[PDB]
Design a protein around this ligand. Structure first.
Ligand SMILES: COc1ccc(-c2cc(N3C[C@H](c4cc(F)c(F)cc4F)[C@@H](N)C3)ncn2)cn1
Ligand SMILES: *[C@@H]1O[C@H](CO)[C@@H](O[C@@H]2O[C@H](CO)[C@@H](O)[C@H](O)[C@H]2NC(C)=O)[C@H](O)[C@H]1NC(C)=O
Ligand SMILES: *[C@@H]1O[C@H](CO)[C@@H](O[C@@H]2O[C@H](CO)[C@@H](O)[C@H](O)[C@H]2NC(C)=O)[C@H](O)[C@H]1NC(C)=O
Ligand SMILES: *[C@@H]1O[C@H](CO)[C@@H](O)[C@H](O)[C@H]1NC(C)=O
Length: 728
């Protein structure tokens, strides 16, 4: 048809997917921001009113980064002065604005460089972390209560996580959990005293004459890890004159005999907390249930309430143990667990009883449980049509497990196969969000008889624009390795002609529990490559991949760098035997784990690939952090798994790169996958006389996400691909 989807279109966000981000504030109302107004919507009728005009803060004098309205409507938190730290951490300033009095609170303000602020879940108490210590404000205009006195930069963290807990365990900076009531505040304390530091140079603005050395406690594989403690404070009995009493909850005997992690914290009732702990050998976990004792003011954890979840074939959970969903009474809960055959299904547990009752089964997986009411459990799975890369909402009747209703499967089957959901409080209403394979579609629904109420956002604007672009298509299908089905996706150029040979770029992640073949709709680099440059972009899910059971997922156990790499080479050979692929023009590329896979494939000597790009790769597992590495790899000791640590490096394959054109890219301020990793790759290739191309990105981290760098890397990569494929 007409213009194609260009690199610039991608780089400059020319064709924008619209979203419908709402925030539930009750069982029947949400907040939504429709151009410099906050609107409140009524879910049942769809009427709205303006909550707050942005004009309110025209003369506030600071650019407001975000906001948080107190659950009771009384106050809004204003976040400005935002400074990114790692993936989820950042610091900021905070002003509180009283919505009834229509004025800023000017007394007893939150300090600058506050690390974390949370409202209680009810009312308007605040808890915040400043200088690695926790402070609680009962009223926003009143002086705070200091909870901890031990916070120490780089060493003791109260209520916030250190580097590896942020990245690998909680996926959050916060380590503060209010009870449902707001009576108790639970928090974790991390101790990094002997964790070694990664050090790297930060060059900063050109005006900085001497570069800065950034130092971060970061346990690489096998190193000393942070230790953790857990504490609960009663915030309804705090004194101005007497220091706050925090009650410690210790980890079970079965954990305390060695290194372990706190891997999950979930309140069950107003006086019951559940804690999951994990051994540093991540094949064994324990859930504790801890009940408050009114008489002593302490927390007791009966050994008979401990639930064990262990694996005999791999590790526990997909990334970590799944979280429990408690019945309103707190005497039982639902959790996703791997069943006798390897499939992740919902299990029913009652608190002072042994076993558990599986309420789903089949050759598919539950992705997550989304809501629990007295009659139904709402969950997301990939059962529909046996497509591991599709996602649908279901409900199961708690009085009869055979009564499962798919709630999303047939709302719009050609356009919609990949749903997520957001339930109101008490799950009276839900927003469904489909992400593919058509354009995203956002809808509101009522849980009573599962009636559609309202289309929220249908992306009709974007639909119309794309009718005007020569858009590529997605093929989603499967091949067979060894009597098992493995799924792959292909991005095909517009006006695809199977009697012509196309160049193929293999897009790789292939990390454990990854999935790269799915029904999601994306506008990305592959879109450009297929639409303008007529390259087929393919992605393949082999051994190690997720959402198809443990047999596939755990094939890679103690063995990273093997089956997941072979499987990509094999997928490529099978793509090249289908007759529309030019087998003298196959390339490969990947980021993070995919850059480790790309390098191991280029270094395999297979002869399949002409060229490849590795961005921020791992090169050797001893360099990456302990929590993630040791999950898949055990420990790099001779009593454990040192030999496969040494056989799984990129560097050992250096000679083989003389058969391929390789482009290696890394940001110098990468705090996650250290520049060290690529420095050691380059050094091995030079020692062996292999020529290659490189690019460093000064001061960029693992996402290489600053917008000029993002643009420059995708541009640099597109030239490399064009040249390797003799494309004009
Ligand atoms: C419910 O809590 C969950 C659930 C899922 C995940 C999760 C983690 C994850 N990771 C990939 C990342 C990573 C791995 C590399 F090999 C690498 F080179 C760089 C890199 F950033 C790991 N730090 C963690 N990827 C997808 N999902 C994390 N938390
Ligand atoms: C949706 O419409 C209803 C009905 O007009 C609003 O309900 C009224 O709300 C105001 C403030 O809550 C009350 O003083 C009225 O007396 C209510 N009347 C009735 C008949 O319900 C509701 O406020 C609207 N909701 C939104 C979100 O704008
Ligand atoms: C959890 O961690 C380790 C590693 O897989 C297991 O300990 C090994 O047990 C196997 C049994 O197949 C022995 O052959 C090895 O000699 C042990 N290796 C080491 C270094 O300890 C342990 O079995 C796992 N636990 C579970 C529940 O399966
Ligand atoms: C919240 O729970 C605590 C402990 O059960 C109790 O003391 C307090 O009264 C509760 N707050 C409410 C619901 O008013």
């Amino acid at each position: 048809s007409r213009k194609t989807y260009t690199l610039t279109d991608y780089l400059k966000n020319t064709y924008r997917l619209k979203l419908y981000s709402l925030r539930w504030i009750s069982d029947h109302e949400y907040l939504y921001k429709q151009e410099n107004n906050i609107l409140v919507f009524n879910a049942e009728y769809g009427n709205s009113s303006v909550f707050l005009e942005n004009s309110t803060f025209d003369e506030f004098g600071h650019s407001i980064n975000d906001y948080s309205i107190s659950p009771d409507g009384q106050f809004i938190l204003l976040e400005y002065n935002y400074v990114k730290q790692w993936r989820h951490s950042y610091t900021a300033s905070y002003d509180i604005y009283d919505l009834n009095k229509r004025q800023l609170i000017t007394e007893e303000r939150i300090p600058n460089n506050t690390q974390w602020v949370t409202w209680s879940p009810v009312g308007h108490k605040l808890a915040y972390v400043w200088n690695n210590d926790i402070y609680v404000k009962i009223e926003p205009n009143l002086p705070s209560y200091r909870i901890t006195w031990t916070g120490k930069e780089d060493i003791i963290y109260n209520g916030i996580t250190d580097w590896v807990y942020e990245e690998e365990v909680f996926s959050a900076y916060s380590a503060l959990w209010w009870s449902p009531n707001g009576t108790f505040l639970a928090y974790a304390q991390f101790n990094d005293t002997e964790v070694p530091l990664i050090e790297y140079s930060f060059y900063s603005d050109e005006s900085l004459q001497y570069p800065k050395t950034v130092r971060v406690p970061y346990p690489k594989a096998g190193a000393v890890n942070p230790t953790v403690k857990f504490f609960v404070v009663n915030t309804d009995s705090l004194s101005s004159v007497t220091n706050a009493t925090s009650i410690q909850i210790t980890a079970p005997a079965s954990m305390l005999i060695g290194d372990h992690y706190l891997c999950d914290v979930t309140w069950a009732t107003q006086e019951r907390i559940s804690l999951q702990w994990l051994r540093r050998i991540q094949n064994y976990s324990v859930m504790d249930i801890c009940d408050y004792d009114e008489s002593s003011g302490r927390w007791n954890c009966l050994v008979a309430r401990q639930h064990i979840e262990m694996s005999t074939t791999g590790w526990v959970g997909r990334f970590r143990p799944s979280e429990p969903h408690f019945t309103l009474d707190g005497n039982s809960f639902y959790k996703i667990i791997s069943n006798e055959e390897g499939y992740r299904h919902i299990c029913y547990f009652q608190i002072d009883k042994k076993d558990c009752t599986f309420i789903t089964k089949g050759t598919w997986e539950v992705i997550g449980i989304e809501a629990l009411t007295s009659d139904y459990l709402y969950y997301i799975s990939n059962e529909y049509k046996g497509m591991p890369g599709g996602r649908n909402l279901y409900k199961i009747q708690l009085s009869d497990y055979t009564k499962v209703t798919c709630l999303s499967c047939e709302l719009n089957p050609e356009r919609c196969q990949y749903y997520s959901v957001s339930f109101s409080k008490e799950a009276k209403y839900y927003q469904l969000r489909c992400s593919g394979p058509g354009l995203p579609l956002y809808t509101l629904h009522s849980s009573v008889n599962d009636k559609g109420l309202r289309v929220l956002e249908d992306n009709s604007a974007l639909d119309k624009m794309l009718q005007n672009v020569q858009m590529p298509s997605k093929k989603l299908d499967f091949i067979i390795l060894n009597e098992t089905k493995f799924w792959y996706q292909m991005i095909l150029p517009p006006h695809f002609d199977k009697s012509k040979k196309y160049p193929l770029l293999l897009d790789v992640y292939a990390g454990p529990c990854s999935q790269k073949a799915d029904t999601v709709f994306r506008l990305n680099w592959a879109t450009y490559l297929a639409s303008t440059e007529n390259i087929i972009v393919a992605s393949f899910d082999g051994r190690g991949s997720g959402y198809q059971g443990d047999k596939i997922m755990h094939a890679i156990n103690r063995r990273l760098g093997t089956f997941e790499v072979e499987d990509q080479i094999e997928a490529a050979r099978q793509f090249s035997k289908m007759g529309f692929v030019d087998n003298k023009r196959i390339a490969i590329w990947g980021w993070s784990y995919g850059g480790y896979v790309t390098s191991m494939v280029l270094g395999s000597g297979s002869g399949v690939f002409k060229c490849g790009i590795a961005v921020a790769p791992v090169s050797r597992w001893e360099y990456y952090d302990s929590v993630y590495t040791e999950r898949y790899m055990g420990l790099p000791t001779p009593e454990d798994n040192l030999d496969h640590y040494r056989n799984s490096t990129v560097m050992s394959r250096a000679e083989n790169f003389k058969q391929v054109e390789y482009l290696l890219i890394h940001g110098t301020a990468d705090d996650n996958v250290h520049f060290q990793q690529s420095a050691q790759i380059s050094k091995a290739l030079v020692d062996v006389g292999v020529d290659f191309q490189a690019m460093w990105y000064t001061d960029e981290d693992h996402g290489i996400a600053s917008s000029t760098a993002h643009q420059h890397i995708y541009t640099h990569m597109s030239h490399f691909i064009k040249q390797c494929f003799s494309l004009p």
